[PDB]
Every structure is written in structure tokens, then in C-alpha cells.
Amino acid sequence: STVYSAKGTSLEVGGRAEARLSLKDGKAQDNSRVRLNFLGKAEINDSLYGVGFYEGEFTTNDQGKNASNNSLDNRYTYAGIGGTYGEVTYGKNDGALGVITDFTDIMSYHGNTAAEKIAVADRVDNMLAYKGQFGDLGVKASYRFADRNAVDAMGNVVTETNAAKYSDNGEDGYSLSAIYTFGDTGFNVGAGYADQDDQNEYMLAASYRMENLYFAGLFTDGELAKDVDYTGYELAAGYKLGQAAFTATYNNAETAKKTSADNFAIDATYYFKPNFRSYISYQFNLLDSASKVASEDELAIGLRYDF
Amino acid sequence: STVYSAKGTSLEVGGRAEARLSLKDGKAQDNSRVRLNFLGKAEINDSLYGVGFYEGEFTTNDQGKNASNNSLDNRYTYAGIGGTYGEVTYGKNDGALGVITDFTDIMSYHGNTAAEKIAVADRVDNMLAYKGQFGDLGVKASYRFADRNAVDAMGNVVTETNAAKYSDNGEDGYSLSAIYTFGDTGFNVGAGYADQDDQNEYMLAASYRMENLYFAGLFTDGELAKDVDYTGYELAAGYKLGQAAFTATYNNAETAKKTSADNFAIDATYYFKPNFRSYISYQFNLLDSASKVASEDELAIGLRYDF
Amino acid sequence: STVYSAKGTSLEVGGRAEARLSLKDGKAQDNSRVRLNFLGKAEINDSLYGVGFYEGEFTTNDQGKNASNNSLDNRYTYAGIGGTYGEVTYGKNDGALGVITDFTDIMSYHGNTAAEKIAVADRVDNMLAYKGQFGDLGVKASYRFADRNAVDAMGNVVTETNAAKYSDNGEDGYSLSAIYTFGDTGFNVGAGYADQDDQNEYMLAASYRMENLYFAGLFTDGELAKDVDYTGYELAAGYKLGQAAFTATYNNAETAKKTSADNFAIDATYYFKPNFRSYISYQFNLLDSASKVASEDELAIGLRYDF
């Protein structure tokens, strides 16, 4: 029953099977998903290595029939090289700000509703991505090229068979972030910045962990388009008791000077094993009459198996 | 060349590569397919475990060119928990009646043409599924929630950005089945029921196995819509001689009081190994002038490798 | 962390993660891709075996947003049987001429621009494929059935529910090739032929390898439609120095009596390990004013991890 890699010294296969039931106004939606991933690494010498990575996400939307479900999202497709000076990759990979949004994104299902990341800062293709650790300072960066297109003699996009010349879409950008870990103390701070076409943002964050408790704060500010502001605040707390972890978050965002998210959420997660867990979560959506839909609370129940 | 699971104690990778040539009126169609699956299990204690499962189906339809083939069907996406009282899952998984249709679904390619299962009884998402064994009695059940949707102030389906309130599609339902195995004797009986919106059905079945022979009967009856009956009958026989297994079935169904299927089929399957087999099969389609297409016989030839 | 095959004695998992940056007129396109493959083999006796194979290709096209990327191509889906007299498969697999085009297709990214293969000769479904080695002679062949369709009483394609009779698309064809290896000398010659509907072609090739050097020639000639000629020429050279391999090719094709490709290209590839390599490549496109687009040079940079 023995499984081998064709060419590598080794291959790590991972991902999840994650059953998720969402209840809003007593009505049920299946938000379940599978992820499959493949990680290969080639040691070159004891200070240099090559890496390759894929991850896909697979869902269903039957709507009451045994349908054919052709739903795939290639979340990551990259190769890279790393070693003494860090790691650099090309192809769809994470920008710089995810490690900052992680300060307050601690829940099983809810949270992360007021820390919007633009593409170059989040996860996107046609991008070089860098990371490295220098003592207690963790750094990330990315640079994204604008995407080549083909245009007619008037400059409109057409098929390469019938085009006059190449142009591009102006979607270049970059991101940067740093995190300082204060020795063994449990304290971290973080910051980052990103810029792409008419969008820019910065983030600042801090956190503390001590034994069975955790808390953290996050501030996000910038512009999602020309003269369209965005500002967001999140706070987070966590408590561990045996194999159970309980979390709460408060998230608040405004967009174009109007409240766009306002949510307090709490959950309980039970770890039967490190890779098998159940959870239940409730999000109080505190926007007023926002339409009724935009304001509905959410109950979520789940079971998560990690491969 | 060594392959590891990222987080699990173990991972089982399975599926098939199955070459299938279909001939009708001397004209060939490629019905070949690949299935890939991933099964993870986490032992919690010696009476409790967690489970996660994915399976996809992958085909081609070139029609004479070297085409790009984007054909995927996520057949199963689920997690569950089981142990002393049985197993329960959420996400796309089997309803109760497949283990009943299996009494007569014994051929490599043909058969199973007069035992139609509705969605909640077959395989569908937004569904809790249960199974367990109590002595010689095997039981299954499922319950399906209706699917949440979003509607305008007049109650028509629209995008959640522009909706007034949540509603649903009324596609709730349930299924149940039981199978009794009569000790070591080779005798089994089975029954089940399913109900969803305007559809309901029941099934009754029996089978006998003794050494190199097998035979079985199946009866299906109910409604596929309001005042639209469905009744189906199947009989099956099987004979094993060395590494070859030969099967024959007769299947007959009526729908809205008219004959909709009438097929006698026979095949031979040779097991070179437990996981590599060839087959040939012929289906006599006995409907009269039904159009010519609806009445054509089918010859099928195949080769099946299981991973 | 242990990974097993469900039913096989063993399973080989392979493929690649391949980062590729393409630059034309200073404008960047992400041509990166992942391939995943699964190869199973069942030994029957010491002169007979069964085989099953899948391979998929997975890409992204974000165009500056963190998009959902549903891009899959099932490149191979087949099962087969082989042993003393060779191997035969059915389902999407290679026709006969790829092993001939390989004489001059030696670069990491460029080359293979003037050796066009028709479907039955390239890779296509509804096809039997054969290969075998008889002393120093390597042979391949394939035969493709025309694809069944369903037509109305006037002979137009419609759904099988509403059709009168079955017809087909006339897309039958075959291919054949042979390669003679002259003992230990480093010399090979090759030839092949293919025919499908209104297309036919032949190929002739020769190559020499000696130590750190390689060179080769390829000639292709035939018709891509009724009274639409195609002729192509390629030359190739290769030099290895430590872990670096350098290649150059010249490719020239005419179609309907006009020059359709004219490219000289050169590259360098560094093998850090057998399964991890970087490359850089430049293609001089020598067509004149062809539109500007059709004539642009290409710089390509890459990193390739093989699983």
C-alpha cells in the first residue's frame, strides 16, 4: 500500500475536510469545503533549498438535486528558492499583510470582517514574494507587475491574433510588513503598508499571550478608490481550558464615511485531537436600519478534519 | 521517494482509472473516467474517531481536437464523527437507499436502470447522514435542510447585496433504510423510504449468496412529482468461475403509467488482480416503436485500474 | 505521517510547480502552472501488467484581483495493459509523433514552433495507443474512432432526448512512427505519419549525442486542410557544462505557402538538483512587417520544482 514521489526526496500532502452549517433567520446553507495541498522541497546544500507548492479548494452547490459540481479554486501556484537570506517565490502566493491581519483573525469561522486587504497585500499572481527572519524581526514584502494585454490600433483589448500591439492593465503594486517579537515575553507588535493603482492602506497591531490567555488589537486605514476612504478596527481575546479554546472579537469598519461592518462574535472550539475539532459560533450583527439581509445575525456549526 | 501526511497519523489515497468504449449502431463514444479520493481518520479513544473525505471525477470530451478539458465533479465533500453509537456526517454524502439499490446493481457497466433514487436518498449536500450496525441489522438515515436563498421585497431570488430578506427553496427531506443479514446463511433482506418536496418512494429487496452463485430482486415504487407515478422492478444473477465473474440483469420501469425502461443485459468481467479487471457487456434494449435512439442496444468494453 | 494506496501495491505521485515570467515589449505575463499526476501499476505475472494514469494542469489568471481561479485541464485519462508484446491503452493518451518532435524539442521554454502535430498524432481521446521495443527499433501507433453524436430526422445535432438516430463527426484517424537507435554510438533516426479527415503529415528526423554535446534536425510536411499546405524545419544544439545546460534552436514553418513562424532562440538552464532548476530564455522572432504582435521577441525566466 506504499505511496512514492516520482522525482522528489519527499512530498507532503495536506489540506482539510471541513463541514460547515450556516444558519441565518432559521434558514440553512452548506458552506462546507475541502482543501488539498502538495509541498515539495529540494535541499541543495545546508544553506540553500528549492520549493514547490499547490493548493486547491473544492465545494458543492446542489440546491436540492444530485448535481455535477464543477467548483475549483487554485488558491496557490508557486515555486521559489530560499536559504540564508530568506525565501523568494513567483506565482500566486501571499503578499505582506496577512501576517498582520492574523493578530486579530483568531476565530474558527467569524472575525476578520474589518481588515480588508488589497490584492498585492493579500494573495495574487504575477508577483514576487519575499520573507525572512533577522533576530526578533520578521519581514515580508511583495512586488506585482502589471498584466500584459493585447490591443487594436485604437488601444482596445482584443485577441492576440487580431491585435496591433501589446499594452498592460496598470495593475502593478507592492507591500511590506514587519513584526517584532519581544524575546520570551509574549509581546508582539506589527505594521505594514501596501499600494496598488488607486488603492493604498496601512496597518498597525499588537498582541499579548500568557499561558491560557491571549489578546490583540488591529487598526487599518487607507483608500479603496480615489476619494473613497476605508478605516477599520478589531479587538480580540482568547482563553484555553483543557482541549477547548474560546474566542471573542469586535470588528468595526467604515467605508466612504459610512459604517459598513459592526459585529461582535463569540465561539467555542473543542480539539479532540490536534487535527480534529468541532466548533459553534455566533455573530451579532449590530448595523441598524442597512437592509434586513445586511443586518442578520449568524449561527455557525462545524467539524474540521485536517489531512 | 517518501510521501507524508501534513497533520494526520495517516492518509489513504484511492480512486480509479477506467477506460470505457461505448458502441451504439456501430458508433463509438469515449465514456472513460478517473476518480481520485482522500480518506483521513483520527482516532480519539478506542470508542470514538473523527473522519474526513473527498472524491472527485475527471473526464475528457475532445471531439477530435487536442482540447483543454475542464471537467470536474466533486462527488463527496464531508467530515463526520463516529464510534459506539455509529457515524454521523455533514456535507455531500450518501442518503439511505444506495445500500438497497446495491442488491441488484452488480454489473460492471449496465444494470441499475429501474431503481431511481431521489436526491435525499441518493447523494446530496446540506444533509446530515447516519449509519450504524446493531447485531445483524444495518441501518441508515439522512435529513436534508432546505437551502437558504435571498429575495427582493416581492419574494424573487436576487444577489445578497440587493435583497430585502432571506427565504429558502423548500428542498428539505429525509431517508431511512434497514438491512437484515440472516446469520451465516447467505440470505439478506432490505427496505427503505425517502421523501422530498413532491417526491416519495419505497424499496424492498432480498438476496441469496452461496459459494460461486448470487441472485437478487428489487422493487421500487412512489411518485417523482404530483400525480406522476414511478414503479420499477429489477432481477439479478451472478456466477463466479476462477477469476471471471458473469452477471445478468433484467430491469423494467414505468413512469406516468408508460414503460420508460426495458432492458436485459449480460456481461463478463475478468479479474487479473483484485484491482485490475477487463470487461465486456451487452444491453438489449427492448422498448418498441420510443424513438430509435431511446431503443438502441449497447455494447460496452472496459479496463479498470483501482488505485 | 504515513500515506497509503487504498487498493494498489503502490502509487507514484508526480508532476511540477513551475513559475514562469514572460516579457514582451517590457510587459509581464504570468505563465506559471502546476501539474499533478498519479501512476498505478499492477503486476499480473513476470510478463504481464496492468496500468492506470491521470494528469491535470492547474493555472491562475487574476488580472490584478484575488480572484477565484477555476482553471483545470485533464491532460491524460487512461488505462492499459502491456507485457511481452508491448503496451496498449484506451482513453486520452499520446499518439505516435511526439517521440519524433522530441528530437528538436530540447529547450526549457522556447522551441517546438515549426513541428505542428494533428490531434491523432498528438494527444486525444477515443483512441487506442500502442508502443513497443524490438531490439534497437522503437515503434508507436494509434487508431482513433469517430465520435458518436445524435441527430434529428434532418441530420442536425441535438440532445439525445429529442434525437431521431445516432450519427458521428467523421473524426477517425491513425498515426505510426519508428525510431532506430544505432547501438552505443549516440546516433538515432526517426520517421512517422498521421492522417485524420482532411489532414495528413509526415516527419523525418536524426540526432547525435556524444558526452557533453547534442545536435538534431527535423522535417515536417503535409496538409492542415484541403489545399492548405504546411512545411516545417527545425535544427537544435545542446551543450552541458557541469550543472548547466545551454540549448539553441532555429525553427521555420510555412502555411498556405506563406512564412508563419521564423524564430531563433537560446537559453541557459541550471540544475541545482535533478528536480530543481532555474532558466532564462530569449526568442528572436524574425518575421518582418506580420503584425507587430506576431513579430515581438520574448524573454522568459523560470523556476521549476518537480514532485
What does the DSSP assignment read for A264-285?
A: EEEEEEEEEETTEEEEEEEEEE
CA distance B136 to C289: 82
- Closest CA in chain C for residue A3: C11
- Indicate if the alpha-carbon torsion angle A22, A23, A24, A29 is positive or negative: positive
The residue of chain B with its CA nearest to that of C81 is B303
Measured in angstroms, the CA of A68 and the nearest CA of chain B are apart by: 5
Backbone angles phi, psi at B152, to 5 degrees: -70, 180
Q: CA distances (Å), C303 to each of A33, A44, C18, C275, in order?
A: 31, 14, 6, 11
Q: How far, CA to CA in Å, does C143 sit from each of B227, C87, C89, C128?
A: 50, 14, 11, 5
Contact B42 A71 (CB under 8 A): no
* A122 φψ region: left (φ > 0), alpha (ψ -120 to 50), beta (else): alpha
* Mutation for A interface: C21, C53, C74, C276, most A CBs within 10 A: C276
Residue-wise over B220-238: b if at least 16 C-beta within 10 A, else e? bebeeeeeeebbbbbebbb
Burial of A19 (0-12, 13-18, 19+ CB in 10 A): buried
Closest Cα of chain A to C63: distance in Å?
6
> Could C17 and A53 be called an inter-chain contact, meaning their C-beta atoms sit closer than 8 Å?
yes
Cβ contact A293–B164 (<8 Å): yes
Backbone breaks in chain B after residues (C–N over 2.5 Å): 289
* Residue spans of beta strands (DSSP E) within B120-172: 123-124, 127-134, 137-144, 148-151, 165-168
Give contacts of B30 with chain C, Cβ < 8 Å. 90-92, 125-126, 147
> Which residue in B39, B62, B298 has the most chain C C-beta atoms within 10 A of its own C-beta, making it the best mutation to test that interface?
B62
Going from the C-alpha of C114 to that of each of A232, C219, C285, the distances in angstroms are 56, 9, 13
A69/B70 CB distance under 8 A = no
Collect all residues with Cβ–Cβ distance below 8 Å to A42 and sequence separation of at least 6.
Answer: A8, A9, A49, A50, A51, C272, C273, C275, C276, C305
Gap between the Cα atoms of A77 and A53, Å rounded:
6
Asked if A236 and A106 touch (Cβ cutoff 8 Å), the reply is: yes
Method: X-ray
Cα B171 from Cα A62, distance rounded (Å):
11
Resolution (A): 2.0
Distances (CA, A) of A253 to A263, C57, C114: 9, 40, 57
List beta partners, residue B168. B148
- Residue A156's identity, in one-letter code, is N
Residue linked to cell 474589518:
A114
Q: Which residue has the cell 537560446?
A: C266
| Residue numbers in A near C37 (CB within 8 A) | 6
For strands B2-5 and A10-24, give the pairing: parallel
Q: Which residues of C touch A3 (CB under 8 A)?
A: 3-5, 10-11, 13
Q: Across the interface, which of A58, A70, A303 has its CB nearest the CB of B79?
A: A303
User: Is the separation of the CB atoms in A48 and A32 below 8 Å?
Assistant: no
User: C-alpha grid cell for residue B268?
Assistant: 463478463
State the count of interchain CB pairs (< 8 A) between A and B: 197
A210 to chain C, closest Cα gap in Å:
31
Q: Write out the three cell numbers for B210.
A: 452461496
Contacts B72 to A, Cβ<8 Å:
69-72
Please check whether residue A101 is in contact with residue A114, taking contact to mean a CB–CB distance below 8 angstroms. Answer: no
CA distance C29 to C33: 12
Q: Which residues of chain A make contact with B148, given a CB cutoff of 8 A? A: 22, 24, 27-29
Residues B28, B16, A10, C270: what is their CA dihedral angle, to the nearest 10 degrees? Answer: 0
Chains contacting B with at least 3 CB pairs below 8 Å? A, C
Q: Do C278 and A5 count as a contact with CB atoms less than 8 A apart? A: no
CA atoms of B175 and B194, how far apart (whole Å): 4
Q: Using a CB-CB distance cutoff of 8 angstroms, which residues of chain C are in contact with residue B15?
A: 6, 38
The H or E element containing residue C170 is: none
Chain Cα centroid distance, residue B13: 20
Q: Judge whether B101 and B112 are in contact, CB under 8 Å.
A: yes
| A66:B148 CB<8 A | no
**Cell, residue C191:** 520517421
Query: Alpha-carbon distance B173 to B9, whole Å?
Result: 36
Cβ-nearest to B19 among C71, C79, C147: C79
Residue A79: which of A46, A38, A119, A50 has the closest Cα?
A50
- Chain B contacts of A29, Cβ < 8 Å? 126, 147-148
Closest CA to C224 of C104, C126, C116, C95: C116
Backbone angles phi, psi at B183, to 5 degrees: 60, -135
C59, C66, C292 ranked by CB distance to A122: nearest: C66
- Chain C: touching chains (3 or more CB pairs < 8 Å): A, B
The total of structural domains in chain C comes to: 1
Sole residue written with cell 485577441: A159
Binary contact (A59, B74; C-beta < 8 A): yes
Q: Give B4's contacts in chain A (Cβ within 8 Å).
A: 10-13
Chain-centre distance of CA A279, in angstroms? 20
The set of residues, in sequence order, having a beta carbon less than 8 Å from that of C168 and lying 6+ positions away, is: B27, B28, C146, C147, C148, C149
The residue of C68, C127, C166, C168 whose CB has the most chain B CBs within 10 angstroms, and thus the best one to mutate to test that interface, is C166
| Runs of H (alpha helix) within chain C | 98-101, 292-295
In order, the DSSP letters of C89-144 are: EEEEEE-SSHHHHTTT--SSSS--SS----GGGSEESSEEEEEEEETTEEEEEEEE
Residue B86, beta-bridge partner list: B83
Inspect the interface and report whether the beta carbons of C17 and A146 lie closer than 8 Å.
Answer: no
The residues near B293 (Cβ < 8 Å, ≥ 6 apart) are C150, C160, C163, C164, C165, C166
Out of B3, B78, B126, whose CB is closest to A17?
Answer: B78
Q: If residue A295 lies in a helix (H) or strand (E), which one and from where to where?
A: helix A292-295
Across the interface, which of A2, A75, A79 has its CB nearest the CB of C305? A79
Q: Which of C107, C133, C92, C68 is nearest to C251 (CA)?
A: C107
d(CA A272, CA A250): 27
Q: Which residues of C touch B11 (CB under 8 A)?
A: 2-4
Domain extent, residue C217, equals 1-307
CB A117 within 8 A of CB A95: yes
Task: Give the contacts of A85 (CB within 8 A, at least 6 positions apart).
Answer: A132
CA angle, B56 then B57 then B59, to 5°: 145
Pairing of strands A2-5, C10-24: parallel
Q: How far from chain centre, in Å, is Cα C52? A: 19
- List CB contacts (< 8 A) between A167 and chain C: 27
- Best mutation target among A9, A46, A124 (most C Cβ atoms within 10 Å) is A124
Taking CA atoms, B155 is separated from A25, B149, C23, in Å, by 15, 10, 52
DSSP character string of B292-305:
HHHH--EEEEEEEE
Supply φ then ψ for residue C100, to 5 degrees.
-80, -50
What distance in Å separates the CA atoms of residue C73 and residue A139, rounded to the nearest whole number? 37
**Closest C-alpha among C115, C104, C45 to residue C260:** C115
Say which of B8, B34, B72 has its CB closest to residue C54. B34
- Any idea what DSSP says for residue B96? S
B58 with C71: Cβ contact below 8 A:
no
Q: Which helix (H) or strand (E) holds B101?
A: helix B98-101
Instruction: Give the best residue of B13, B90, B159, B172 to mutate against chain A (max A CB count within 10 A).
Output: B90
Nearest Cα of chain A lies from the Cα of C33 at a distance, in angstroms, of 7
Least Cα distance to C307 among C2, C55, C48 occurs for C55
